[PDB]
RNA sequence: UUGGAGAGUUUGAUCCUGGCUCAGGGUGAACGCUGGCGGCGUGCCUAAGACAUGCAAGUCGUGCGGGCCGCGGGGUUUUACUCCGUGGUCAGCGGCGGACGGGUGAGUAACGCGUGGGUGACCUACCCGGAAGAGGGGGACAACCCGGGGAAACUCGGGCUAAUCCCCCAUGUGGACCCGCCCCUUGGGGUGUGUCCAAAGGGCUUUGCCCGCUUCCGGAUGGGCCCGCGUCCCAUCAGCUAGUUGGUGGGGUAAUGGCCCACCAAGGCGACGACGGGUAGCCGGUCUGAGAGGAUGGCCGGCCACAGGGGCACUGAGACACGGGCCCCACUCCUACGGGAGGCAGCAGUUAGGAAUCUUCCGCAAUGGGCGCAAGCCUGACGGAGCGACGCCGCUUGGAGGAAGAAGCCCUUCGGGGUGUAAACUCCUGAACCCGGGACGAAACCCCCGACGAGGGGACUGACGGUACCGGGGUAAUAGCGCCGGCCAACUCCGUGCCAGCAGCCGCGGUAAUACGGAGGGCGCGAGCGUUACCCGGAUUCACUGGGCGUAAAGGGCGUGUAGGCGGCCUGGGGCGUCCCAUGUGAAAGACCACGGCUCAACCGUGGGGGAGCGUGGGAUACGCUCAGGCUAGACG
């Protein structure tokens, strides 16, 4: 059960914008356009101050939330990520953002991540030559990630490019419309994360 | 519910019998020069031996003497006899000991 | 290599055997302090050398008798008794602290 | 009778072999003496087989009668080529 | 320096002490609600209870002789009888394997295991290497035939006979024992005289090649014994011991040894905890922990121990021998009541016990092992499948669009908010499912050429499995459980009324319940979620790290001094502790880093690095220790 449920009311509970369904939540409504107060009878309600664990775990979910990934997996990555040499924070979302799924979504093949994933269990993805279903694969660097063959003639992915002439891709990856393909060229740097949450308080919680 | 796997026990019969024969023929040879000595026979003592130290290091050649055991039973038998010699010195044959 | 110890010999009761007291020395597992222990290790005197308060070099051997696996190796200082006077008085305590009757 | 034989250490359906030295009597997965290299039946890598005759031959010097299947891969390692 | 989070609770209120409780991680789990898929792993933790059935070690006719059933062929004019070759089948004699592999943890607190050592106290089948030899003579017993006993299991007796079975004799390369000497130095090596000891044959491509045989030195591997250190709880267990400790001789073993016996002696151990009791296989590792430490030792690997309970030995390189033997005991079964037959702690399974732990499956293809010249036989070792959400890891139940927002359900200050982009509806993709193709693992032994060497050529052979996997087509296609007073993320209505009930702790509930029960809504996690149990953690709450004792629990009623601990200044020696260096060891697997393998990961491979402890050698000498010399500040006169 990898979630899979009502979206937008994420987006709500945690007051900051979440981009789950790429266009749509773009156009007056993911829904924090005008309504920002979480679900709920008691979203018009007062909040009262926020225990430390309380901000530490929200700011924990706004993170897994947002790559929409089951704790299961968030924390095996987060363990792994403590034996790496490194910083224990940055070097997370390194992996995180070595997802074949999620590689899928900044080289813009699919609107969005969940789009993303479908997009590669249902084997539209191309990694070095041989198609790959699982998005759990990390993307090492210098990999070409591309479409299949097969389904570069989709009335979707085809849509989805049209729209890549006038975006700038993520300065870590490169892509060749003209050929549906892309490269992963190194792994992205804190500096180079737009993300807006606060690593430290998601470390800080693994700690309890 | 049988087992011809048995028949090593079937054999084994045939062995026990077998060495028995052997290292009981030692015991009373043995026990026979030794009283030899006693008396001061230096002439059969050594006689009956030399029998001895012949089926000794036969039944090594065998399985029915260790190996090293057929040499304790021989340095445990001349050296008993020797000494014993000395209540009546001389050896007549001059077999079984080196001098 | 042949294990060798140093000790004193404690017992001459024995024909032919004396017994070595070997202290030994060593930090503690755990509180690190140096702790002294020490064992009596059975020696074998062929002709009857060593004496009581004598200080002996023992060496492995062949076994000799059941608990009596070393040979005594050279002297070290003859004459020193202070040393078995402390096994002798410990001994003697020995005799108290029991439930058979204390007295003075 | 020391012998020369492979052991199993890859996985149900993951065979990866040891071509090592031990005593006949001690089992396929047991102390050995001296490993001597590897074999693996898949072949997933271009290195899919090692040995270093250099003790190889020590052994069958000493005494080893090797595998019927052991022996193949000592010969394609050139343990016994006289050139 | 890649590493350490706390909260609730004694009061009217405060601070300290202090106990209780909780959040975390983990499991060979079990129970509840729910339950789709795959990979890998794992699955009696309790009665080491009892166990039907089947299978779990055999294999050689290139060691020897035959029985049965049958075929072919010879000597016979013919007949009967007979001779050779042969297929099948059976067992026997003999060799090798049964002492491995598989199980299990009862016992065991011990040189049992760990670790480092010793063996001038040792053995070691088959393998490897090197040296020497196989000369002559004779014997026994099964099978088989004849007879007797018994209900049975099985047994007795008489007779024949082969062999690589057995025994004699000679040769002796050599080897053994006594005695002497030389060297060494515990039973090590050289040597001299005396004495004693060898051996089988079989097959072919049969004048040579293969297998096997004998003695001896060496090797390799495997193992016996022995020593230092390490090894749980109780002192409401304090003295234990008579072969007991030692000695001489003798026995016995491969061999040291009170191991055993005889005699001699009077010893040996204990608070550095003897003895007694309780408990428990040990370890590599594994769990937790910031670490120290605590806990653990199933799966895998190493060592040990038992194979219904106890005893014993045989045979053998090896056993005191799980599917060999002798005896006693308990049990179960046959019984003509004399007397017998049994041992799943092998695989599967049965039953019992229990909270609880699987299929009487496939295969011998692979890897290994036994026997064989080989073809090959055996191989519930093993490789595979199956069953169990028991664990872990991967996967799905869809994606994009879509109202100022439907209905229904809840809340309302009745105006409206909420569930909610959620639905509906639009399009797109397409697990399942369908057709086709379809695997690595597997290349050897063998055979041929070559010299049965090297080298080269040829053949056979898969349980998994038509499975993985690739191609093509193809349906929008499971969700549940805990929780929402504080700790602790999540708040309203109603029902109820110290009731019914919750509850880890504090507590909640007597008509206004964010704490009971449903509901909407919310949080958390997701084929799972909870629960109970148990380990470590929080707990520096047994305190080495890292605690305390005026009143919180805690100074002994006081002194005396035993053992022990601890100890002043200067000089030197030794260098035991102590520190540095080099070296051997510290198996493998695991952990760690790195690279790679299976679409990822779990899982796996390959390579690197690290280490405490101990052995040996070398060094240092402050400090501790020790010996020596000297001092006077402690002490004493
Ligand atoms: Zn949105």
Known sequence: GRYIGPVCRLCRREGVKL?????????????????????????????????????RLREKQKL???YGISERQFRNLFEEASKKKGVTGSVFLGLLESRLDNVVYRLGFAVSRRQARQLVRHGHITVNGRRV????????????????????????????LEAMKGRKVGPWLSLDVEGMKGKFLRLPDREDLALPVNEQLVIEFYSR | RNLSALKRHRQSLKRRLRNKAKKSAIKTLSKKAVQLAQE??????????????????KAAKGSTLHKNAAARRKSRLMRKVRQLLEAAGAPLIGGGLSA | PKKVLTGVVVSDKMQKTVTVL?????????????????????????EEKYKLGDVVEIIESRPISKRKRFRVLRLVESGRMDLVEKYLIRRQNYQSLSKRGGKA | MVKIRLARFGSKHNPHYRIVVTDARRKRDGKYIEKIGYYD???????????????????????????????????????????
């Open chain 3, 22 to 46: 070997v202290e030994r020395q060593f930090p503690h597992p755990l509180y690190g302090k140096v702790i002294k222990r020490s064992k009596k290790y059975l020696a074998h005197d062929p």
């Open chain 4, 41 to 83: 039946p898949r072949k997933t890598t271009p290195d899919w087989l090692k040995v270093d005759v250099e003790r190889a031959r020590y052994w069958l010097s000493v005494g080893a009668q090797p595998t019927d299947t052991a022996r193949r891969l000592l010969r394609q390692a050139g343990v016994f080529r006289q050139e």
């Open chain 1, 64 to 66: 897994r939330r947002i």
């Open chain 1, 19 to 55: 981009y789950l369904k790429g266009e749509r939540c773009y156009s007056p409504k993911c829904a924090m356009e005008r309504r920002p107060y979480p679900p709920g009878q008691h979203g018009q309600k007062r909040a009262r101050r926020p225990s430390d664990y309380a901000v």
């Open chain 2, 40 to 57: 001061g026979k230096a002439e059969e003592a050594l006689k009956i031996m030399r029998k001895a130290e012949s089926l000794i290091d």
């Open chain 1, 133 to 160: 279903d699982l998005p759990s694969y990390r993307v090492r660097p210098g990999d070409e990630i591309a479409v299949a063959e097969k389904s570069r003639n989709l009335e979707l992915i085809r849509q989805n």
